């Protein structure tokens, strides 16, 4: 056989770069507080999401 | 006020003067006479407008002055700008950057129209603020409403390298091709002393921030040259690239046009290629037209010629109209008869109407009698010349004695040749 290894013989931090975490993008479709459509915009002055 | 297009030779022909039954009228919208020829022209016009069959070819033949070019202009004005009508002379294919064959192919493809319809989602608004840290946020405004957007790196790189700035009326599409639309009218007084040559100040949009662009536009199939080079629309403004590869012309562009047609994003509208003075073509060009007419999506050819039995260019052979028999076999021939004492007078009357000249009926009689002896096309020129000679005489109507004032100044081919007894 001809198999391959990569050994991080240095500080394990250099392997620690890669693993753990892997979160989702938590937000989901936001609903506006007026017409209750799913939002298309976020107002710069309130940060409220809105549609129409 | 005088504009670019003013009174030319065929200016009075505002259409082909036919009934709904394709029956020609004695005198109608600009055209006079040639009942047989105009009925035939109407029939081929109808098959142009149906568009169902490909590579049809018609030869308008006859003596100089019958109305072959006049009939072609009648067909071209009867047909709307929607259908491509390409007019060339047979002399225009004798190129230096192309061969005869490639230029003739390009003309053929110029006679096929393609109506693009394109349908794109757009974000448009005045930029209120941009922030960049790489990541940032963008505040867009329309007179109705305002929003934040979050920017990724490609969007950021095309904000900065575009030097978009607060106040710019910006426009962004899905699969962004961001283009700067305008400049805010508030960040103004900049032209207290100067503006950039590209800068504009018209105001920010209204309604929703997200909209849909419909765009419809007729290109000709010759848009093949839009894909013959790296940057290629330029070659539609300078004729540029010469023999673009057939391996991309006949399969890629036709295939993608068929795909557009099937999806519904395009539609071919086949038009007309009018080669005037077609006898100027070489046997190479004629024998090319042989196969070109057989092709799946040729336009309809119209040809005009005034030649008898004459030599074909590029040969020592003689044939009808000066074009080969194997190509006449592929044509329908429309002959044109000359005008009599009745129709010559009437087209002179039409030309006086077009040039806004008023003539005595005596002057009409004289001008017709002069035209029937030397040439039809000459009596048309005496109209304007007599108008001018009468304008300096403090007159208001062209008179019989004025036609003779012109008739001795500007002498016909006949009298001009007859006075070559001097042999310098
Ligand atoms: N049927 C017609 N109706 C109105 N004007 C015509 C007609 N035929 C010819 N004329 C006039 O006479 C001129 C000569 O006709 P034209 O078609 O140019 O000659 P050719 O038949 O050699 O092309 C035209 O330029 C036009 O002004």
UniProtKB/Swiss-Prot annotation, chain A:
The molecule here is called Vacuolar protein sorting-associated protein 72 homolog
Species in which this protein is naturally found: Homo sapiens
Query: What is the gene name?
Result: VPS72
Q: Which family does it belong to?
A: Belongs to the VPS72/YL1 family.
Signal peptide range? none
How is the polypeptide modified once translated? Phosphorylation is enhanced by ZNHIT1 and promotes the interaction of VPS72 with histone H2AZ1.
* Disulphide bond pairs: none
Summarize which stretch of the complete protein this chain spans. 261 to 312 of 364
Q: Where in the cell is it found?
A: Nucleus
- What function does this protein fulfil? Deposition-and-exchange histone chaperone specific for H2AZ1, specifically chaperones H2AZ1 and deposits it into nucleosomes. As component of the SRCAP complex, mediates the ATP-dependent exchange of histone H2AZ1/H2B dimers for nucleosomal H2A/H2B, leading to transcriptional regulation of selected genes by chromatin remodeling.
Subunit details for this protein?
Component of the NuA4 histone acetyltransferase complex which contains the catalytic subunit KAT5/TIP60 and the subunits EP400, TRRAP/PAF400, BRD8/SMAP, EPC1, DMAP1/DNMAP1, RUVBL1/TIP49, RUVBL2, ING3, actin, ACTL6A/BAF53A, MORF4L1/MRG15, MORF4L2/MRGX, MRGBP, YEATS4/GAS41 and VPS72/YL1. Component of a NuA4-related complex which contains EP400, TRRAP/PAF400, SRCAP, BRD8/SMAP, EPC1, DMAP1/DNMAP1, RUVBL1/TIP49, RUVBL2, actin, ACTL6A/BAF53A, VPS72 and YEATS4/GAS41. Also part of a multiprotein complex which contains SRCAP and which binds to H2AZ1/H2AZ.
Swiss-Prot record, chain B:
Which SMART domains does the annotation name? AAA
The main place the protein resides is: nucleus
Q: Which residues cross the membrane?
A: none
Which sites are covalently linked via Glycyl lysine isopeptide (Lys-Gly) (interchain with G-Cter in SUMO2)?
421
Phosphoserine modification sites are 414
> Changing residue 277 to Q: reported impact?
Reduces ATPase activity. Decreases interaction with NOPCHAP1. No effect on formation of RUVBL1-RUVBL2 heteromeric complex
GO molecular function list: ADP binding; ATP binding; ATP hydrolysis activity; ATPase binding; beta-catenin binding; chromatin DNA binding; DNA helicase activity; identical protein binding
What keywords are annotated for this sequence in UniProt? Acetylation, Activator, ATP-binding, Chromatin regulator, Cytoplasm, DNA damage, DNA recombination, DNA repair, Growth regulation, Helicase, Hydrolase, Isopeptide bond, Membrane, Nucleotide-binding, Nucleus, Phosphoprotein, Transcription, Transcription regulation, Ubl conjugation
Q: Which GO terms describe its biological process?
A: box C/D snoRNP assembly; cellular response to estradiol stimulus; cellular response to UV; chromatin remodeling; DNA recombination; DNA repair; establishment of protein localization to chromatin; negative regulation of canonical Wnt signaling pathway
Provide the Gene Ontology terms for cellular component.
Answer: centrosome; ciliary basal body; cytoplasm; cytosol; dynein axonemal particle; euchromatin; extracellular exosome; Ino80 complex
Q: Where in the cell is it found?
A: Nucleus matrix; Nucleus, Nucleoplasm; Cytoplasm; Membrane
* EC number, UniProt record: 3.6.4.12
Catalysed reactions listed for this entry: ATP + H2O = ADP + phosphate + H(+)
**UniProt: ATP binding residues:** 62-69
Q: In which tissues is it expressed?
A: Ubiquitously expressed. Highly expressed in testis and thymus.
Concerning PANTHER family, the annotation shows: RUVB-RELATED REPTIN AND PONTIN
The task this protein performs is described as:
Possesses single-stranded DNA-stimulated ATPase and ATP-dependent DNA helicase (5' to 3') activity; hexamerization is thought to be critical for ATP hydrolysis and adjacent subunits in the ring-like structure contribute to the ATPase activity. Component of the NuA4 histone acetyltransferase complex which is involved in transcriptional activation of select genes principally by acetylation of nucleosomal histones H4 and H2A. This modification may both alter nucleosome -DNA interactions and promote interaction of the modified histones with other proteins which positively regulate transcription.
User: Domain notes, please?
Assistant: The C-terminal domain is required for association with ATF2.
Per the similarity annotation, which family is this?
Answer: Belongs to the RuvB family.
**Could you describe the subunit structure of this protein?**
Forms homohexameric rings. Can form a dodecamer with RUVBL1 made of two stacked hexameric rings; however, even though RUVBL1 and RUVBL2 are present in equimolar ratio, the oligomeric status of each hexamer is not known. Oligomerization may regulate binding to nucleic acids and conversely, binding to nucleic acids may affect the dodecameric assembly. Interaction of the complex with DHX34 results in conformational changes of the N-terminus of the RUVBL2 subunits, resulting in loss of nucleotide binding ability and ATP hydrolysis of the complex.
Q: What is this protein called?
A: RuvB-like 2
| Source species of the chain | Homo sapiens (Human)
**What lineage is this protein's organism placed in?**
Eukaryota, Metazoa, Chordata, Craniata, Vertebrata
Gene that this sequence comes from:
RUVBL2
């Amino acid at each position: 056989c001809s198999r391959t290894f990569i050994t991080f013989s240095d500080d394990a931090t250099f392997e620690e770069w890669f693993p753990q975490g892997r979160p989702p993008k938590v937000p989901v479709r936001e609903v506006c507080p007026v017409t209750h459509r799913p939002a298309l915009y976020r107002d710069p002055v309130t940060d409220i999401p809105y549609a129409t | 006020v005088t504009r670019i297009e003013r009174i030319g030779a065929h200016s009075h022909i505002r259409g082909l003067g036919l009934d709904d039954a394709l029956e020609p009228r004695q005198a109608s919208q600009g055209m006079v006479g040639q009942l047989a020829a105009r009925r035939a022209a109407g029939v081929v016009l109808e098959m142009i407008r149906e568009g169902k069959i490909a590579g049809r070819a018609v030869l308008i033949a006859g003596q100089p002055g019958t109305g072959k070019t006049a009939i072609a202009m009648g067909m071209a004005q009867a047909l709307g700008p929607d259908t491509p009508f390409t007019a060339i002379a047979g002399s225009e294919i004798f190129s230096l950057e192309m061969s005869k064959t490639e230029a003739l192919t390009q003309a053929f493809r110029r006679s096929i129209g393609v109506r693009i319809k394109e349908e794109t989602e757009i974000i448009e608004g005045e930029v209120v603020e941009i922030q960049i840290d790489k990541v940032g946020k963008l505040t867009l405004k329309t007179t109705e409403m305002e929003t934040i957007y979050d920017l990724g790196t490609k969007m950021i790189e095309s904000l900065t390298k575009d030097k978009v700035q607060a106040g710019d009326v910006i426009t962004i599409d899905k699969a962004t091709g961001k283009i700067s639309k305008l400049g805010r009218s508030f960040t103004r007084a900049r032209d207290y002393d100067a503006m950039g040559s590209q800068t504009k100040f018209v105001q920010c949009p209204d309604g929703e921030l997200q909209k849909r662009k419909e765009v419809v536009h007729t290109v000709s199939l010759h848009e093949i040259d839009v894909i013959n080079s790296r940057t290629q629309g330029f070659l539609a403004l300078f004729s540029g690239d010469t023999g673009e590869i057939k391996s991309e012309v006949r399969e890629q562009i036709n295939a993608k046009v068929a795909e557009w047609r099937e999806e519904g994003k395009a539609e071919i509208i086949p038009g007309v290629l009018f080669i005037d003075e077609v006898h100027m073509l070489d046997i190479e060009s004629f024998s090319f037209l042989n196969r070109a007419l057989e092709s799946d999506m040729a336009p309809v050819l119209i040809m005009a010629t005034n030649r008898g039995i004459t030599r074909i260019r590029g040969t020592s052979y003689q044939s009808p109209h000066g074009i080969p028999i194997d190509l006449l076999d592929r044509l329908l021939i429309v002959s044109t008869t000359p005008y009599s004492e009745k129709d010559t007078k009437q087209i002179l009357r039409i030309r006086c109407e077009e040039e806004d000249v008023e003539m005595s009926e005596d002057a009409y009689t004289v001008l017709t009698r002069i035209g029937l002896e030397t040439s039809l096309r000459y009596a048309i020129q005496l109209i304007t010349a007599a108008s001018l000679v009468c304008r300096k005489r403090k007159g208001t109507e062209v008179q019989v004695d004025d036609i003779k004032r012109v008739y001795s100044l500007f002498l016909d081919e006949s009298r001009s040749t007859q006075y070559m007894k001097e042999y310098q």
